[PDB]
Amino acid sequence: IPEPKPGDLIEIFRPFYRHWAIYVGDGYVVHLAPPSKAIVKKELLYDVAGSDKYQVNNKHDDKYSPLPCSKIIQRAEELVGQEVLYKLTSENCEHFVNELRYGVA
C-alpha cells in the first residue's frame, strides 16, 4: 500500500469497529485516541494501524472540495493535545477528520 498524501482520510478496519485518522506527512497521522476522555494525538500510522488493514478514503471529494492541504495539516497539528469528552465511535472520529479535511460541516 503506497504512502498516503498529506490530508488524506485514513479508514482503519479494526476487528468489529472502524477508526479514522488524517495523514499529516512523514509517516504521521492525527486522530482522536484514549490517553491509555479522549485526546487529539499525532502518532505514526505504522503504530495506529498496527496489524489492522486500512485504506485512504476521501469519500466526500466527489461532491465537496477539500481545503488547501497546507491548511488541513496546519489545523490538524494545532489541535494536537486538545481533549474532548465524547466517545470514540467511528462516527465521531470520522466527523473529526472530515472537519479537518473539508471544514466545518
Q: What is the distance between the alpha carbons of residues 6 and 70, in angstroms, rounded to a whole number?
A: 8
Which is catalytic among the residues 31, 60, 69, 95? 31
Experimental method: X-ray
Sign of torsion over alpha carbons 41, 22, 64, 59: negative
Question: For this structure, is 95 an active site residue?
Answer: no
Q: What is the distance between the alpha carbons of residues 88 and 72, in angstroms, rounded to a whole number?
A: 21
Question: For this structure, is 31 an active site residue?
Answer: yes
The residues near 82 (Cβ < 8 Å, ≥ 6 apart) are 39, 40
Residues of 51-81 as b/e, b for ≥16 C-beta within 10 angstroms? eeebeebbeeeeeeebbebeebbebbbebee
Resolution (A): 1.6
For 25, 39, 64, the CA distances from 43, given in Å and listed in that order, are: 11, 12, 27
Q: Which helix (H) or strand (E) holds 83?
A: strand 83-84
Contact 100, 22 (CB under 8 A): yes
Which is catalytic among the residues 19, 60, 69, 95? 19
Radius of gyration for the alpha carbons in the chain, expressed in angstroms and rounded: 13
